[PDB]
Structures are given as C-alpha cells and as structure tokens.
Amino acid sequence: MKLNISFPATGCQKLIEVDDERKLRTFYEKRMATEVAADALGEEWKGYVV
Amino acid sequence: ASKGRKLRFHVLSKLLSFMAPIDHTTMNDDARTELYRSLFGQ
C-alpha cells in the first residue's frame, strides 16, 4: 500500500509507503471523492483533510 | 384468410420442440377435480 499525495495549491506530489495496517484502517470502507480527516497518518497530520 | 386472418394448423418447424414440459403443482389430481366442482357458488 502506497499513497500518492498531491497538494494542488502549491502543486507538489509525493509518494509515501505506509506499511502499518493501523494507519490505513481509517481509509478502509470509504468511497471515492469523499473527504477524510487523515489524523491517523501521524503527528505531522493534525487537522489535514484529504 | 388473407394476411393470416384465418387460423391455420400447419406444422411450424422452427417452433418445433422449442420447450420441454416442466410441471410443479403440489395439489394432487383428485384434489384438483373436487376444487373445480366446488368453485364459486357451484
């Protein structure tokens, strides 16, 4: 499971490998084009919405 | 009889053996006969 994350306002892309199932539990059973609060990704991601 | 206005009983080859008879009726034949005599006010 890899995450291809993009910030359009700055226009920057990054690829991050997440090996922990725990952090990916938040994204499971969710559809496309839906807003998700990705606080589970880590301490850097506080208040981020994807 | 023009344009098939009158019923005809010639054999139709393409429709021959088009289906096989399958029957699923629980009610027995003796019960069927008694019911129809008893139908409605009869």
């Binding site: - | 027995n28 003796d30 019960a31 008694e34 019911l35 005599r37 008893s38 139908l39 009869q42």
Partner: protein, 229 residues
C-alpha cells in the same frame, strides 16, 4: 433401514435418506398405524425425491386366515381402521357460511347403525394428523367428563342425506373451579392449564376462574389450509 418411519417427523426423514440404499416400512390402518394425512405426505416426498422407488403392501396376517370375525369386530369397536375421512361434498364459503354443531356424547357412542357410521367418520379425522393413534384416546372421549366435542358442518340444504359431511372437529375440556387452599397445599407438595400457570406465576388466585382448553383441532386432510380452523 428405518423402521416405524411414520412416527419420525418428516424433516428427519429427508436427512436419513443420503445417497445410499434405503429401506422403508410403515403402518396403515393399524393399532399404532399413523393416519392417512401423514402417510400420504411421506410417500409424496419419497416420489418427489436415478432414484428408483418401490412400493410393497402386505395384506395377510400370519396368525389367522383373512376374514376372521374377531378381527373385523375388534377393529370397528376400537375404531383403529382409518378410511377416507369424509366424502368430498361441495365446497362452502370458508369464513362465511359454516355453523358449529354440538355432538351429544350419549347419542354418538350408542351402537345405532347411523351413530356408528358417524363415529367412524369422526375417529378417522381425529387421528389423521397424529403421530401414533392410541386406542386409549377414544377411551377419554366417550366417557371422561367435560370433554365436549364440536363439529363444523356445511350449510344444510332443504334436502339432505342421512349423515352430513364433517369438515372440522374440536374437542374442548372444561377446567377450573378449584379451591385456593388446594392450590396452596399443592404448591407445598384440574389439568395442564390450571396447575402449570399456578406453579409458574405462583398465583393462588388463578384456578378459581373457570376456563377450558382446546384438546384437539382437526380439519379434513384434503381441505387442510383453507381456513376452516
């Protein structure tokens, strides 16, 4: 081999079949022979279920020659032979045009020829949907008190035959009118519905009310499910 297969409920019979060779045996018009309705259902299940079905019937006793006067006399006396439950009369409006009738116990069980024919009709319907017919159950009906028997009959025409066809039969036994003190004594140490309620809720008040239970309700096997009940 499954012996006395009529006694076993039908769902268990299906599992016992399996893919292996299977032998049946059943009792019809016997002392413990199951009624017509259950037997017809089983053979319908067997015929419905590369299986080759074989039906064999036995008509001759091993002890006495057929036609023995004792056997025929005893069979009618105890009403152990179930036959066609009733002649197929014209069907009636189900919840609309049927009236209950009160059969008199004294007049039913006297040995008049007309009464005997009606008794055989009632008994065959009575033990139709029952696992093992008991001669003892007849012993309760004819003499035991408060066992009131009720029959539902087609609307009578102006012209009628000797015996109307019987659609449904209900046997009701009246209970109650039992003293409070006897209940109090019994809890420390006249049928199912008074005693069981008394012991479960522990109410001495219950029992002093008069009420009856429906011992049996039956409908004609051909007409089963049309709403006579």
């Amino acid at each position: 081999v499954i012996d006395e297969a009529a006694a076993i409920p039908l769902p268990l019979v299906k599992s016992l079949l399996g893919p292996y060779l299977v032998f049946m045996a059943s009792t019809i018009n016997g002392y413990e022979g199951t009624g017509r309705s259950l037997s017809l259902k089983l053979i319908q299940q067997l015929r419905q279920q590369a299986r080759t079905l074989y039906e064999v019937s036995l008509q001759e006793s091993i002890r006495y020659a057929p036609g023995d006067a004792v056997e025929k006399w005893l069979n009618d006396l105890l009403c152990l032979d179930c036959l066609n439950i009733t002649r197929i009369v014209s069907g009636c409006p189900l919840p609309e045009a049927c009236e209950l009738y009160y059969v008199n116990r004294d007049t039913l069980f006297c040995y008049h020829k007309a009464s005997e024919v009606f008794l055989q009709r009632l008994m065959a319907l009575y033990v139709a949907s029952h696992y093992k017919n008991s001669p003892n159950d007849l012993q309760m009906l004819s003499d035991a008190p408060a066992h009131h028997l009720f029959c539902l009959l087609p609307p009578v025409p102006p012209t009628q035959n000797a015996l109307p066809e019987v659609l449904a039969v209900i046997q009701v036994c009246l209970e109650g009118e039992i003293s409070r003190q006897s209940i109090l004594n019994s809890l420390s140490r006249g049928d199912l519905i008074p005693w069981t309620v008394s012991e479960q809720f522990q109410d001495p008040d219950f029992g002093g009310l008069s009420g009856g239970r429906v011992v049996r309700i039956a409908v004609h096997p051909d007409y089963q499910g049309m709403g006579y009940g």
